[PDB]
Design an enzyme around this catalytic site. Structure first.
Site, PDB file in Angstrom:
ATOM      1  N   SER A  29       0.964  -1.511  -0.256  1.00 23.07           N
ATOM      2  CA  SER A  29       0.151  -0.019  -0.130  1.00 23.07           C
ATOM      3  C   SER A  29       1.007   0.828   0.387  1.00 23.07           C
ATOM      4  O   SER A  29       1.734   1.565   0.348  1.00 23.07           O
ATOM      5  CB  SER A  29      -0.944   0.325   1.328  1.00 23.07           C
ATOM      6  OG  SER A  29      -0.276  -0.437   2.564  1.00 23.07           O
ATOM      7  N   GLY A  30       0.511   2.124  -0.596  1.00 21.65           N
ATOM      8  CA  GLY A  30       1.441   3.698  -0.347  1.00 21.65           C
ATOM      9  C   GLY A  30      -0.046   4.640  -0.042  1.00 21.65           C
ATOM     10  O   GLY A  30      -1.173   3.549   0.519  1.00 21.65           O
ATOM     11  N   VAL A  35      -0.341  -0.355  -4.545  1.00 17.00           N
ATOM     12  CA  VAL A  35       0.501  -0.079  -5.624  1.00 17.00           C
ATOM     13  C   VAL A  35       1.247  -1.657  -6.375  1.00 17.00           C
ATOM     14  O   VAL A  35       1.759  -2.086  -5.376  1.00 17.00           O
ATOM     15  CB  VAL A  35       1.875   0.668  -4.518  1.00 17.00           C
ATOM     16  CG1 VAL A  35       3.127   1.194  -6.221  1.00 17.00           C
ATOM     17  CG2 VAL A  35       1.707   1.641  -4.020  1.00 17.00           C
ATOM     18  N   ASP A 165       6.348  10.535  -0.348  1.00 15.81           N
ATOM     19  CA  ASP A 165       5.150  11.152   0.434  1.00 15.81           C
ATOM     20  C   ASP A 165       4.422  12.583   0.923  1.00 15.81           C
ATOM     21  O   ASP A 165       4.633  12.603   2.182  1.00 15.81           O
ATOM     22  CB  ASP A 165       4.414   9.971   1.612  1.00 15.81           C
ATOM     23  CG  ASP A 165       4.614   8.654   0.685  1.00 15.81           C
ATOM     24  OD1 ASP A 165       3.821   8.666   0.105  1.00 15.81           O
ATOM     25  OD2 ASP A 165       4.009   7.784   1.998  1.00 15.81           O
TER      26      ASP A 165
HETATM   27  C1  533 Z   1      10.987   0.589  -1.054  1.00 18.72           C
HETATM   28  C2  533 Z   1      10.017   0.602  -1.915  1.00 18.72           C
HETATM   29  C3  533 Z   1       9.391  -0.601  -1.523  1.00 18.72           C
HETATM   30  N1  533 Z   1       9.170  -1.507  -2.621  1.00 18.72           N
HETATM   31  N2  533 Z   1       8.795  -2.926  -3.536  1.00 18.72           N
HETATM   32  C4  533 Z   1       9.203  -3.581  -4.688  1.00 18.72           C
HETATM   33  N3  533 Z   1      10.480  -3.190  -3.749  1.00 18.72           N
HETATM   34  N4  533 Z   1      10.699  -2.395  -2.470  1.00 18.72           N
HETATM   35  N5  533 Z   1       9.826   0.903  -3.052  1.00 18.72           N
HETATM   36  C5  533 Z   1       8.621   1.857  -3.449  1.00 18.72           C
HETATM   37  N6  533 Z   1       8.357   2.064  -4.756  1.00 18.72           N
HETATM   38  C6  533 Z   1       8.177   3.306  -4.977  1.00 18.72           C
HETATM   39  C7  533 Z   1       7.198   3.400  -4.410  1.00 18.72           C
HETATM   40  C8  533 Z   1       6.449   4.337  -4.610  1.00 18.72           C
HETATM   41  C9  533 Z   1       4.618   4.821  -3.901  1.00 18.72           C
HETATM   42  O1  533 Z   1       3.899   5.610  -4.286  1.00 18.72           O
HETATM   43  C10 533 Z   1       3.804   6.159  -5.729  1.00 18.72           C
HETATM   44  C11 533 Z   1       4.063   7.503  -5.383  1.00 18.72           C
HETATM   45  C12 533 Z   1       3.771   8.857  -6.782  1.00 18.72           C
HETATM   46  C13 533 Z   1       3.753   7.763  -7.600  1.00 18.72           C
HETATM   47  F1  533 Z   1       3.230   8.305  -8.813  1.00 18.72           F
HETATM   48  C14 533 Z   1       3.435   6.211  -7.559  1.00 18.72           C
HETATM   49  C15 533 Z   1       3.359   5.481  -6.487  1.00 18.72           C
HETATM   50  F2  533 Z   1       3.698   4.302  -6.359  1.00 18.72           F
HETATM   51  C16 533 Z   1       5.058   4.254  -2.714  1.00 18.72           C
HETATM   52  O2  533 Z   1       3.750   4.327  -2.131  1.00 18.72           O
HETATM   53  N7  533 Z   1       5.939   3.533  -2.424  1.00 18.72           N
HETATM   54  C17 533 Z   1       5.560   2.392  -0.965  1.00 18.72           C
HETATM   55  C18 533 Z   1       6.964   2.925  -3.073  1.00 18.72           C
HETATM   56  N8  533 Z   1       7.574   2.143  -2.889  1.00 18.72           N
END
Ligand code: 533
Length: 347
Positions: A29-30, A35, A165
């Site tokens: 989740s974001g 996500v 964020d």
């Molecule tokens: C370290 C973290 C988690 N992860 N996922 C795979 N490997 N590690 N990576 C990551 N990358 C991008 C985002 C984007 C996130 O949010 C966004 C923000 C803006 C957007 F346009 C698109 C998004 F998805 C988000 O909430 N998280 C937690 C993220 N985490």
């Protein structure tokens, strides 16, 4: 023209995305949505795609959706999360109900890097330098992150960092022994006063200490316990700061506490670079008026090997007059729609 969209069920919902995005896989989740990781066949990048949940449910939700889109569209900085794409399957305003946001998929956050262990001093320098470089940019547009913590600081394999964020938690998730509150400035944790950008510098101080020691700086079991941990380190407030606590109740509570002097940071952070200690002392000041700013901190001797005044850019003006505007759901929705359709992808 409009790309071709295809449908897929992922996070309990039907995701409809352009063909260019392949191999969609849930990654958690974001802020205000879930996500998925994906492969962008047009750019060759691994991307994170966030679908907002009920983006126009109420006035609060609709304004929040507009806010995030405005923030993401503005941010064009190496150390700040940017918008690679934003799309809707909707063909008109009347059919418009879903918003998808696309950014770089990041490999790890600062929680994953810390892993209960100390980092080397050079690693701390580089990581904190990049946070401050990003913060200088964000603050120059009069944006406050408000909730900086290791979990919204993401890093690639070469330890290149981006801030997630910014500019956007309920009472329940701020309750108890939780990382959601450990990095918060005392003035916002206990609503002492109208707060500003300096709250973020407190957060950097807390993060920097934790990188240096491998341990949470103020791991409070609740708001009160956390305040006591803070005041033990930095001293109880003086008359000067007390006057600035506009909250009569909060100021009255503060004065009930036995006075304590600021501790010696060299005795707290044993073995740490004396320049790191000095910087921590300038960031972790109780009176927010007196904290070092991001621009000032970049010039501190601790970052001598990374600092370049010609490669620490500021942001274009950010119009946030909308924050004080009262509008109906459909009006926030129409503003949002305009922003989606007018998006131009980065180089
Ligand atoms: C370290 C973290 C988690 N992860 N996922 C795979 N490997 N590690 N990576 C990551 N990358 C991008 C985002 C984007 C996130 O949010 C966004 C923000 C803006 C957007 F346009 C698109 C998004 F998805 C988000 O909430 N998280 C937690 C993220 N985490």
């Amino acid at each position: 023209e409009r790309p071709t969209f295809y449908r897929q069920e992922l996070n309990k919902t039907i995701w409809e995305v352009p063909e260019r995005y392949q191999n969609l896989s849930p990654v958690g989740s974001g802020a205000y949505g879930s996500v998925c990781a994906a492969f962008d066949t047009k750019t060759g990048l691994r991307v994170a795609v966030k679908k907002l949940s009920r983006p126009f449910q109420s006035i609060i939700h609709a304004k929040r959706t507009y806010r995030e889109l405005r923030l993401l569209k503005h941010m064009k900085h190496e150390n700040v999360i940017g918008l690679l794409d934003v799309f809707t399957p909707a063909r008109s305003l009347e059919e418009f109900n879903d918003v998808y946001l696309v950014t770089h998929l990041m490999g790890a956050d600062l929680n994953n890097i810390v892993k209960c262990q100390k980092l080397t001093d050079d690693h701390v320098q580089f990581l904190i330098y990049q946070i401050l470089r990003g913060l200088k940019y964000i603050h120059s547009a009069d944006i406050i992150h408000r909730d900086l913590k290791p979990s919204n600081l993401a890093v690639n394999e070469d330890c290149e960092l981006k801030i997630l964020d910014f500019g956007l938690h309920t009472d329940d998730e701020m309750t108890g022994y939780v990382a959601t509150r450990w990095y918060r400035a005392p003035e916002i944790m206990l609503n002492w006063m109208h707060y500003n950008q300096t709250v973020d510098i407190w957060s950097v101080g807390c993060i920097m200490a934790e990188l240096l020691t491998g341990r949470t700086l103020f791991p409070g079991t609740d708001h009160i316990d956390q305040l006591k941990l803070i005041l033990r380190l930095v001293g109880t407030p003086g008359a000067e700061l007390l006057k600035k606590i506009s909250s009569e109740s909060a100021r009255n509570y503060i004065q009930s506490l036995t006075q304590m002097p600021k501790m010696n940071f060299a005795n707290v952070f044993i073995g740490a670079n004396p320049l790191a200690v000095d910087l921590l002392e300038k960031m972790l000041v109780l009176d927010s008026d007196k904290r070092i700013t991001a621009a000032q901190a970049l010039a501190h001797a601790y970052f001598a090997q990374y600092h370049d005044p010609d490669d620490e850019p500021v942001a274009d003006p950010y119009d946030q007059s909308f924050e004080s505007r009262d509008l109906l759901i459909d009006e926030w929705k129409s503003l949002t729609y305009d922003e989606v359709i007018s998006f131009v992808p980065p180089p």
